[PDB]
Structures are given as structure tokens and as C-alpha cells.
């Protein structure tokens, strides 16, 4: 059993660790028309991803029998729920009451994979104009009204950290044979966030046949996104997405393959 | 041994045409000004999705007293695109400089895997609704009285047309569907937040009490679903639209011998 | 040998007449102006549904010291018609150009399968209510005092008439019902969203801790339920109506020898 | 092997007199105008319910170094009367011509089965409350200081009087209760909807980790509970009353040999 | 099979048992600017922690084989949910209605370990100016915008009661090999609190290899925080954190180890 640890930082829009709003989005702006809907880069949450390099197993990749790393299980943890207990920051308040803590829509997902997470493109609006330096369904097909449902042409891989927006991309259930993904979504404008944390819980990654993800290229592929909802600064009614970092501890073993 | 079949079924929220700019939503919902004048346009209601997937022919010769049928053993299913509701920059209602108000309200989730069409039982919130011609509704199969507000045993149909059987008039019939497995949940309210989980690690077993999965008559696999996520509100108004999401099915099939 | 019995029980929400245009609803709920003049009309309250299903006669002679009884071993039950609550185009209250306000409020779900009528315990929110002629209420079996607001052990009855025992005055008696299995849940509030799951894949075992299911006295299967989904609000005003839904039962029975 | 004991415990919501017209409720709750003049009348607070059920004498001679004790091995418990909260026609607050506002607010549920009185730990929201004469409160057993707002280890008592130990000053003591099993849940809020499940099909095992149930000292079985459902608001005003419900217990016991 | 039991009092800001607001914070003040955000120490909740001394097991610590106390299981309980059923105190009310009970954000965590709990620094705002005598990320590292996500340098041990604020410190999932920790968080301004209590539930502390926390220096390390939400006195709209005490009953055995 080989243990691999990693923390993936949230990519909430302010993805630069020198910027004072790191781990939040920039203030979210809202379209004045369907056809003029143009969100800046910094105002949308992204999938976080990392390829962790694994020890080289085959001193010759020509042999018809090889060793590949198998992900057998994962302990994962969203850290920092405790930060949202801060209600003395410069936040909206009612009379002399506490600062209004982060609330709204929540999006939790992690994936452990032997290759990049397969993504399927889908959108709330076909008419959105995404900025430059983002991978969105437009990058791979003709975005029509079909993208508001299932357009089987809208396929991609999560290979760039902080560049694939959650709002255009779902884990593709029709692929991801070599990846396990898990997520949940809870909507609403002001819904309270919920989180549980413990170091006592292991997720088994073996499939129906006892085969974990197999790490192509001696690469272990971690993906996630942990939106806690919106923060509101005491400066106004403008809101920012707030995300938290995710810990991964993956257990691997060597598996012989043809 | 095990044959994998997969399919995506797209939502039928009333804008059922993939050329239309509001595909995957209803048209703006209108409300009756009287019980007796209640006439929903067909583009303003959500429908059951359904697809008959053709399977490989198993029997060269149908004279044979022993034949093979495809047996649905398990299904991995997945409502895709909960992530799209994290879009709050679209042209939506907002409070001051706050984010766009996301999709909220009543949720209706249902899926079925069968070896024939899903059996439906007619039931309505109002017996006085006038449905457009071209929809299959309780009127289509029996005389509609007040009885339809409860259980009218004569109001039986089969889900045999995609995007034409409205959810508001049809429930899966639990007194039939011997050769289908169905699963659903409903959460009401006007502004209830939507909830969804997704994973590719979860298999639902379709074998009945006797270890028999759905058996695919005519070498067809019958998939059906509806996935209403609630109501969208465009920043043009207070008019609301149903929002649905597509559903993946990956059904595990094996060959089952049957006496002919 | 497993014999199957299936039945639908229609809700008794107050409009218990299948010819009435508000069947499956209550009449408009009125509210007392004083604790001492609290007089609810029969049509304004939800009732327990119940039905005795006749079973095949088993014993040609009842003198015999060994007899067969039908034993209920399991049940598949389903509340039908959650899909009807996805109708928001009816003549209903609305906010601006938004959808009709769907059914919301207090929910009460219960089902029972027994070999005799459900045992009831009388209990009331107010001892001063004056119930109308035609209903079976604690006053029918005992002297009603303030004790009826807690547990009055005199307030005993059997659920032997469909749509005449108001839910508001009768609980399933946990001190009796040796020969019945009952199940239920309650969720209060004025505007709480209703919740429902449905499937044809879930069986409830009726065998007690001794391996014995309900034994059908007089070759009768006793089915009981109530399925209050909340209150409907017509677009004519702020007046509200209870809304209930029908329940399906599929009971698996076997013959069980008994000593007499 | 098994002896069955059954009992109902009525709620002690502050109107603890079965001849009072508000039995099963509190009197109208009053609120302090200062921390230092906070004086709740006894009828305005809910209490623990308790009862000792006598059990057959097993030991004719108490000098014997081997004796039998009754061991509680399991319990079926039920909160009765959630159905009564479906009454929305009583003289209750209402919005326009809507139904009466049903019971909502904070819920506190607890039950305990023990071979002696339940051990209580004193703890308070305010150390400055002045409790009326005739109640057992932390003041009865120790010096009440600000320590009582957290854990004051000197604030120890035994639930030995029905309707006299206010729930707001007393927790089940997890440092004692070796010879008791207790279970509870709390759900706060001013207007939270109440939730209840009921069934006669569920048994809770009372055996500890070493397979030992409560052992009935003095051949008594000690039942305790509290079942606050929230607040009732009469149509007379905005004054509220605690509303509680009775709890049924059915305890299974066996004889166990012990060493004196 | 040895039994340890302890009550840990909450450290909600009024950490002083002589103070009339023991078990609550002082009234919470809110920053008027990101850069002047200075929380007085009495207005934040802290981790509670204690070290329970255990019997000495080894005469000679030089030996290559020794006995350590092993934590196999714990019964834990938050006490005092019943106190929140008091709606007659001097509290906000609507008309002649009951006092508004404690509502808002809840934070529950407990930990049982063979050494102090490992903490990872993380903040909602890198710009907060923490008062004197608290241990906060800046106490151990260079605080920058990195502290708003995961800064690997922000590492500490929960070694002082009522001095590590919950809003700066998460249990570190990358350490705590010799600790089990459990927690849950539920946000919102007015969310109803929820609590279950029973004496019938045991949590197993053995890891995947069947080993519990092993008590270094014959000390058992208990950590917790139990914030129930905010109280609002009838004097105004000013709020106080409200916390509750936590009971621990830890079962220990002797385990032989290779030194
Ligand atoms: C549950 C109850 O007591 N209902 C009353 C009802 C309501 O109080 C009222 O409709 C408000 O919702 O009042 C009823 O009519 C009454 C007459 O019988 C009486 O002569 O005059 C009363 C005037 O206060 C009152 O209108 C009704 O609507 O049916 C009687 C019913 O029992
Ligand atoms: C919990 C508490 O202290 N209750 C008080 C109560 C309330 O403060 C009041 O009803 C508002 O809800 O006040 C009581 O009556 C008091 C008199 O005894 C006193 O002489 O004058 C007071 C006026 O400032 C007040 O009316 C009451 O209603 O019973 C006493 C109770 O302890
Ligand atoms: C968390 C924080 O920054 N708290 C401030 C506090 C609050 O901003 C204020 O009470 C609103 O809730 O302000 C404190 O006092 C301040 C003075 O130090 C200053 O001279 O003037 C300030 C306003 O301009 C304010 O009065 C306080 O109330 O304790 C200080 C605290 O850090
Ligand atoms: C999603 C979207 O279309 N955003 C646009 C916003 C908003 O319309 C307004 O800020 C109202 O929130 O306007 C801009 O001028 C801006 O501030 O950058 C352009 C930006 O593209
Ligand atoms: C469900 C229903 O009856 N809708 C009817 C609507 C609504 O009453 C109004 O638009 C108010 O919402 O009125 C129409 O003229 C319309 O707009 O198409 C006819 C339609 O039959």
C-alpha cells in the first residue's frame, strides 16, 4: 500500500494566490439581456485538478506484461468550514447583529482517476459569451440550443487547473471508465451551507470487478470543486463565490496488466 | 456474459424542439382565471421522456421451443448538469447588486427500465382542465369525471410517445409494471432549493423478488424518465419556466432462456 | 403458496363523494371565532380511509380444533399522484406573472395492514370542539373532558367505517393492534413543501418478532390509510382546502394453521 | 422467558391538572423585561414526565448472596397524537381566509428506561432566573452561580417527581445513568415545523455493550420522557402555549441472576 | 479495558466561570472596513482541550518493547440542548409571543488522540488583526492571501484551552495519524439548531489496521467545540455566541509497542 497526499486549492475566480480575494470570486455581475451575457473570467468558479507523478514501474514499456499503479481507496476532506464561523468581518448586518455569513448554492465534487476526468458540456444558456482563456463547449463543437440539454458532441478532458467552468461542464457518466467521481448540489439563493469533516472515513475506488483506477503514464489524476455559496462584503450588495480547499490521501498498489 | 447498453434521454419540459432557443425549459407558464377555462398550452407543461432501444436479435429461428431474451440485470443512472444551476450571471431576477436568482421550486425525478412500455395510471389535480388535442391524457382513454381527482381504475395507458404524456396527468401504475422497475421522488413548494447527487460508482439491481430482471419483448429496452429541477425566472419579468435536465442510463443485460 | 391481494383506497379529505367536483379535496376550511363555538362541518376535515377485502373461505366447518387463516406476510404500498402537484396552471394564487402556488402545508401519511380493524386511541387538540352528526369521535365512545387533550384510556375505538373517523381525533393505538402493522409520519407547518417517493421495488415485511404476520379474522384483510399532502388555495381567494392522494396496496398472503 | 410491561405517560407542559381546560399545554408564556427579574410561573414551563412501574417480587429473602432482578432487554415506544396537529379549525391565528396556524417552534423529545430514577445534570440558559416554589431546580441541590450556564459538577439530581423538574434546567447526566438507557433529540427555532414518525413495528434493544439491560432495583421499572411539539397560538392574540403529547412504552423484561 | 471520563466546558469568549455570561461570547462587533477588522478576544469561540493524565506503564523508557495506553472507543455527548427550550428569558419577542431562542451557525467537533490535535491555519480574511494572547496563523507563519485557501506553512498543535479561535484553525487531515476527529458545520444567520443525545452510542477509534490512538507521555488528549448559534438579549439586536459542554467517556487498553 503506497500513500499519496495532496491539497487542491479552490479556483473560485480569483485563482492568483497574491490577490487579496484569493479563494473567492470577483464581485458577480449579472446579464442585462440574454444576448449580452458576458461573464468575466474572475466571476465564475472552476474545476481544480492536479496530476500527481507516481514512481516509474517498467524499466521497459515494450514488454507485453507491465505494472500499473491502482488507486484502491481515498480519504478526502473539505477543510475550513470553521472559517465561515467568522461573522465579525466587513459583512452585511441587520441592526447590531452579526455579519451575514456565506450562504447560497453549494457544489461539491471530487474525482480520483488514472487519466483526466471526462467532461460533458451543458449550459443554462446557449447565448452566453465566455471570455478568452476558458475551455467551454464552444472550444469543441457548434454551441446551439441543444447545449441546454445533452449534446453528445460536447466532450472534453479536465487537463487545465482553474480554466474549465463548473457551469458549462459535468462529469461525463458515458465515459470515465478509469475514474471514480462523486458530487452533490444544493441550490437556492440563501440556503445554509452544510459540511462534515473527519479523518476516519475511507472511500473504496474498486469497480464492480475489484479494479481501481489504473494510472496511465504513472500519473494519478485528482479533480474537485467545493463551492460553499456567496460572501457579501459590508461595502454593498455585490456577492462573491467562496470556495474551500480539498485534501486527498490516495492508497495505491501495483497491478499487472497485458 | 454481460452486454452494456447506454443512452441519454433529453428532457421534455414543453419546448421539446432542439432548434428552439428555450430547449430544456417550458414556455412561460400561464395560469387559469377560472377552473372551467383552464387550458394549458402544450409548450407550458413538462412531459415524460421515453426511448425504446433496439437490442441485438438473439433467435435465428422463432420455431424453436427454447428461445433467448435480454434480461435487464442492473442500471447505472445519472441526472447530468446540476452544475449548470451554479450559473447566476445569466439574465435573471436579482436583489440589488446580488447574484441572479437560480432555479428553485418543485422537483420531480423519475426513471424506469422495462422490457415493454411503462404502465401509467391517470390522475389529475383538476377534472375540468382542457388539454390540447395531440396530448395523450386521461380523456384519451376514458370519460373524465371528478373520479380522476382520485383513482379512476379505467384511466390506464402505456407510455408509448416521447414528450406527449404530461407528468401532471400520469403516475407510474404500481398495479401493473410486472416487467418494469420504476423509481421516483417529488419535493414541492414554490421556491424550495433543488438537491442532486451524482456519481459513476452506484448500480441499481433490477432483479425482482424471484431474481428476474425486466425481459425485453421484441428485443427492445424501454427507458423512461422525467427530471424537473424547478422554475427559472428570466430578468425580463416574473414569468416562470420549468427547467429539466437530461438523464444517462447504462443498463447491464444478460441472455435468459425462455420456454416457447 | 403466496396469494396476492391488490387494492386502491381513495382519500377521504371531506368531499368523500366521487360525483362532487372537489372530490379528493376538503370543502373550504373555516376557523372558529371562539374555542366554545368551534363547529367544523364534516366536509372540512380529513378522515381515515379503510376497506375490508374479502378473502377465499378456508374452513368448510368452524367447529374444527385446527383451522387455516390467511396470514399477511408482506405489502407493497404506494401513494399515487405526486405528479399531479406539478400542475401550477390551475386557477390558483400567484405572485405577479409567476406560477400558481402549489399544494403546501401539514402532511399526514399512514397505512395499516391487519387481520381485523385498526385499533384507535381518541385524542384532540381541543376538548371543546362540537363535532357534527354523522362522524365517529371520542364523544361516541366516552365522556369528553380536558383529559382527551392528553391520553384518556377510555377513548377506545375501531376503524370500522370509511370516511367517518377524523384523523384530528384518532391515533393508531400502540397499546392494542397486536394483529395489525401500522406505519406513518407527520410533518407540520402552514407552508411546508410536501415530499413523496414512489417505486414498485420496495416490500415491507409484516411478520412480527415471532415470525407471524396479521391473521385475517373472518377471512377479511383490513387496509387503512390517510395521505394528506397539505392545503390547496383556489385563485378565487385565500380560502384553503385539504388535498389527499390515493394509496395502492399489494399484500402477499399464505395459509397458516391455528389452534381453536 | 419474556414479561411485557406497558404504560402511557401524559405530558407535563405546565398545565399538569387533567381537569384544567388547557391540559397538555402550558399557560400563556410570559417573557422577562430584565435578566434580573426573570420569574417564570410554574404553569408556563414544560417538565419531565416520569413513572415507576412495579414488577413482581423475585426474592423472598434478601440475605441470599444470589438474587434475581428484572432486566429490561427492549422497548417499543411511541409518541401519540401527531394527528391532532392536523386540526386547523380551532380558534387559532390565521392569514386572511386561510387555515388556523398549527403548532410550530422548538421540539424536545426524550425517553429513558432505567432500573432506577434517571440521573439529571443541572444546566441553565441564565444563572439569574428565579424559579417558583415547589419545583426541583439546580438551586434545590447546590449554589447557583454563572457556572450553571456550562457544566457545574455539583448540580446533580434524580428525576423522582413527575411534573416538577423543568426541562430547561435539567439534562440526562451522561456521567451517570449506568443503569438507564436514554435517547433524545432537540430541534430549535421560533416557527420550525414539527416532525413525527409512528409505528408499532420498531423495537429498541436496551442491552449495553456487555449484553446487560437496566436492572430493576426494588422491582421498579423507571420510565421518563418529554415530548414538546412546539407552540400553539390561540386566535385571541399573539400569546403562545407549549404543546406536548403523551408517550406509550412497552418494555420486555427477563430475569437475571446477580451477586449480593 | 480502562475508563476515562471528562466534561469540557465551552470557550465561547466569556471563558471565565465568574462572569455572568459564562458559556456565551461578549456582544459581537462587526468590522467597518476589511483593514480595521479587529475582533476583541471575548467575541470569538475557541477550541476546548484537556490532557487527562493516565497511570505510568513503564519503569524504564530505554526498553525496546513498552506498554502504551490505547484509545479503542469513546462515548461522547453534547449536554444542555434542554436549556434552549427557555423562551422566557429577557430575549427579543414578536408581539406577546415567546422569547426568540438561540439560532444561527452551528459548529460541532470532538477529537480523541494520543498527542495534541494537529491544526491547519485558514481564514475568511487574510487582513484580520487578531488581539494579544491568541494563537492564530501569524503566530507560526507569514500571513498573506494564501491563508484564505491552503497555506502548507500554517501548522500548529492545539496545546492551549480557550486561546485557538475556531475561525482560524481546522483539524489537519494531512497529520493526526494518532488522533481521530469528527465534526459537522451548518451555516446561515437564523438556522434552527439540531442536537441528538443518548448514552447508547459508542464510536470506535481503531484505525484501518486495528490500532487506536496511543497515549504519548501517558496523556489522553480531548479536544472539542460546540457552538449552538447566537443568543439575542431583549436589550437590543446585539448577539452572543452560545456554546454547550461536551462529555467524553474513553475506553483504553494496554498495547505493547516496539521502541
Ligand atoms: C370551525 C367553525 O367553527 N366554523 C364556523 C364558521 C367560521 O367560524 C367562519 O366561517 C370563519 O372561517 O362560521 C360558520 O358560520 C357562522 C354562522 O353559523 C353563525 O350564525 O354566524 C357566525 C358569525 O360569526 C358564523 O358566520 C360557517 O362559515 O359555516 C359556522 C362554522 O361552524
Ligand atoms: C418571565 C417573567 O419574568 N415573567 C413575568 C411577566 C412578564 O414580564 C410580562 O407578562 C411580559 O410577558 O410579568 C408578570 O407580571 C409583572 C408584575 O408582577 C409586576 O408587579 O409588574 C410587572 C410590570 O413591569 C409585570 O406585569 C406576569 O405577567 O405575571 C410576572 C412574571 O414573573
Ligand atoms: C470586529 C471589529 O472590527 N470590531 C470593532 C468595533 C465594531 O466595528 C463596532 O462596534 C460595530 O459593531 O468597533 C470597536 O470600537 C471602534 C473604535 O475603536 C473606533 O475608535 O471607532 C470605531 C468606529 O469608527 C469603533 O467604535 C468596538 O466597538 O469595540 C472596536 C472593534 O475592533
Ligand atoms: C454577465 C455580464 O453580462 N456582465 C456585464 C456587466 C453587467 O451587465 C453589469 O455589471 C450589471 O451587473 O457589465 C459590465 O459592463 C461589467 O461590469 O463588467 C460588462 C459585463 O460583461
Ligand atoms: C392555463 C390557462 O388557462 N392559460 C390561459 C392564459 C392565462 O389565463 C393568462 O395568460 C394568465 O396567465 O390565457 C391565454 O389567453 C394565454 O395567455 O395564452 C389562454 C390560456 O388558455
Numbering used by the authors:
A (entry chain CCC): 41 to 298
B (entry chain BBB), C (entry chain AAA), D (entry chain EEE): 40 to 299
E (entry chain DDD): 41 to 299
How does the study describe this entry?
Polyomaviruses are small double-stranded DNA (dsDNA) viruses with a circular genome of approximately 5,000 bp. All glycan-binding polyomaviruses analyzed to date engage oligosaccharide (glycan) structures featuring terminal sialic acids that in mammals are usually presented either on gangliosides, which are molecules composed of a glycosphingolipid, i.e., a ceramide and an oligosaccharide, or on glycoproteins, which contain mostly complex and branched oligosaccharides attached to amino acids during co- and posttranslational modification steps. These sialylated glycan structures interact with loop regions at the outer margin of the major capsid protein VP1, at the apical surface of the polyomavirus capsid, as revealed by X-ray crystallography and cryoelectron microscopy. The VP1 surface exhibits an astonishing plasticity, providing virus-specific interactions for a range of Neu5Ac linkage types and further specific characteristics of Neu5Ac-containing glycans.
In the crystal structure of the HPyV12 VP1 pentamer in complex with 3′SLN, the Neu5Ac moiety of the linear trisaccharide is engaged in a binding site mainly formed by the BC2 loop of one VP1 monomer. The Neu5Ac N-acetyl group inserts into a shallow cavity, forming a hydrogen bond between its amide group and residue T69. Additional, nonpolar interactions involve the methyl group and residues P79 and H128 of the counterclockwise (ccw) VP1 monomer. Finally, the N-acetyl carbonyl oxygen forms direct and water-mediated hydrogen bonds with the backbone amide groups of R78 and T72, respectively. The Neu5Ac glycerol chain forms hydrogen bonds with the side chain of R133 from the ccw DE loop and with the backbone amine of residue V70. On the other side of the BC2 loop, the Neu5Ac C-4 hydroxyl group interacts with the protein backbone. The Neu5Ac carboxylate group is not involved in any direct interactions with VP1, only forming a water-mediated hydrogen bond with the side chain of residue Q83. Cα atoms of the BC2 loop (residues 67 to 82) from the liganded HPyV12 VP1 structure superpose with the respective residues of the native structure with an RMSD of 0.3 Å (55), indicating that the Neu5Ac docks into a preformed binding pocket within the BC2 loop and that no conformational changes occur upon ligand binding. Well-defined electron density was observed for the Neu5Ac ring in all 10 VP1 binding sites of the asymmetric unit, and in some sites the Gal ring could also be unambiguously built into the electron density. The interactions used by HPyV12 to engage terminal Neu5Ac are strikingly similar to those used by TSPyV.
